[PDB]
Each structure stands twice: as structure tokens, then as C-alpha cells.
Amino acid sequence: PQITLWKRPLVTIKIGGQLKEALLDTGADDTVLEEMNLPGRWKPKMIGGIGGFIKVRQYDQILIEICGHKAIGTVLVGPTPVNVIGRNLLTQIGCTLNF
Amino acid sequence: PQITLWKRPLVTIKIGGQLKEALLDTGADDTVLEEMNLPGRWKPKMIGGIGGFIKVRQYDQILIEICGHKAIGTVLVGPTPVNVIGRNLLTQIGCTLNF
Numbered sequence: 001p002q003i004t005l006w007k008r009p010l011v012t013i014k015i016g017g018q019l020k021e022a023l024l025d026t027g028a029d030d031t032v033l034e035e036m037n038l039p040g041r042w043k044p045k046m047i048g049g050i051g052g053f054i055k056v057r058q059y060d061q062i063l064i065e066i067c068g069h070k071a072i073g074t075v076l077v078g079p080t081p082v083n084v085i086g087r088n089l090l091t092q093i094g095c096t097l098n099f
Numbered sequence: 100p101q102i103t104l105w106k107r108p109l110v111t112i113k114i115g116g117q118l119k120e121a122l123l124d125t126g127a128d129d130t131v132l133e134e135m136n137l138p139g140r141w142k143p144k145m146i147g148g149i150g151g152f153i154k155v156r157q158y159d160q161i162l163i164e165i166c167g168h169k170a171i172g173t174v175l176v177g178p179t180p181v182n183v184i185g186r187n188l189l190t191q192i193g194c195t196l197n198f
């Protein structure tokens with residue numbers, strides 16, 4: 001679909017069997033989700049944002065369906081203010097910016 | 100144009116008679132730019148993301164050119180690690196997400 005930006009580009013995602021709302025975030029290199037239970041081995045990692053760095057759990061090779069489009073990539077879980085879908089997955093669903 | 104998301108969506112902008120580089124950021128409600136000494140009044144503000152909040156100066160009705168597309172709106176100036184063009188200006192240049 002084509003998504004205009006008058007509102008936040010929020011979409012429903014499916015990860016680990018449950019639905020969630022997430023933000024399509026072209027300014028994020030990586031995908032960061034709020035605290036949740038996820039099946040899969042994880043490794044402690046750190047990611048920086050506008051206000052500093054946070055501790056996250058890095059799940060590699062996770063299945064995630066974004067607005068009806070399947071992806072399999074890295075998902076970071078930690079105290080992010082909002083669920084953000086970053087470029088590592090936006091590229092997988094074929095997302096581009098257009099103007 | 101069409102911008103793929105393999106790499107960061109960096110573009111040249113013109114603001115206050117200066118050229119800078121900034122990210123077309125669908126995850127940013129408002130535009131945030133590095134410290135620059137703009138003229139006119141401003142209102143203090145705090146904005147939050149991954150890592151917490153930074154303090155910024157809010158200027159309104161600032162003229163910005165983005166790839167030759169002119170826009171006018173709010174610009175937040177502060178110690179941000181990266182310049183991001185937010186939705187308040189992305190809408191004004193006709194920018195959409197497409198997959």
C-alpha cells in the first residue's frame with residue numbers, strides 16, 4: 001500500500017504468535033520492540049537513540065509479519081518508548097520512500 | 100524520486116541559508132536539527148526517544164528546502180546526534196511509504 005504521513009505510520013505486526021502495533025520508522029536502522037516474551041535464543045546488546053543508549057535483548061532470525069508482508073530478521077527487545085520497525089525489516093517487505 | 104532503505108535516507112536540506120544533511124524520518128513526528136543559531140524567538144521543549152529525552156528549542160514557520168521541494172513548519176534545534184526531517188515537513192513534500 002501507499003501510506004501518507006499526516007498520521008503516524010502505525011501498522012499491525014505479528015511476532016511470536018501475537019499481534020501488536022508498530023511504527024514504520026525509516027530513521028531506525030534496527031527494529032526495537034517493547035518488553036515482551038519471545039521464544040528464541042537472545043544475546044545482550046546495546047542500541048543508541050536520540051537520548052542515549054539502552055540495554056536490549058537481540059533475537060536473530062525471527063519471523064515477523066508486517067502489514068501482511070513476511071520478514072525474517074533481527075529484532076531488539078527492550079525499553080523503547082514505542083515499537084519501531086527499522087530498515088533491517090522495511091527493506092525485506094520492499095518498503096521505499098517516494099516523493 | 101524513489102529512495103530505497105538499504106542505507107540511511109540522507110538528503111541535503113537548506114535551512115537558514117545553510118546546507119545540511121538530514122534523514123527523511125517517518126518515525127519522527129517533528130523535525131529535529133543539530134545546534135544552529137537561528138534568528139527569531141523560540142519556545143523550550145523536551146522530546147523523547149530511545150535513551151530518554153533531550154532539550155531543544157522550538158522554532159515555528161521555518162522555511163526548509165528538501166531536494167528542491169520547499170516546505171515551512173516547526174523545526175526543533177538541539178544537541179541531537181542526527182538531523183531528521185519529521186512528518187510535519189515530509190507531508191509538505193508529498194512523501195509516502197510504499198510497499
Ligand SMILES: CC[C@H](C)CN(C[C@@H](O)[C@H](Cc1ccccc1)NC(=O)O[C@H]1CO[C@H]2OCC[C@H]21)S(=O)(=O)c1ccc(CO)cc1
Nearest residue numbers: 027028029030048049050126127128129146147148149181
Ligand atoms: C519514539 C519513536 C522514535 C524513537 C522517534 N525517533 C525517530 C527515530 O527514527 C530515531 C531517529 C534517530 C536516528 C539515529 C540516532 C538517534 C535518533 N531512530 C532510532 O532511534 O533508531 C534506533 C533504533 O535503530 C537504530 O538506528 C538509528 C538509531 C537506532 S527520535 O529520534 O527519538 C525523535 C524525533 C523527533 C521528535 C519530535 O517529534 C521526538 C523523538
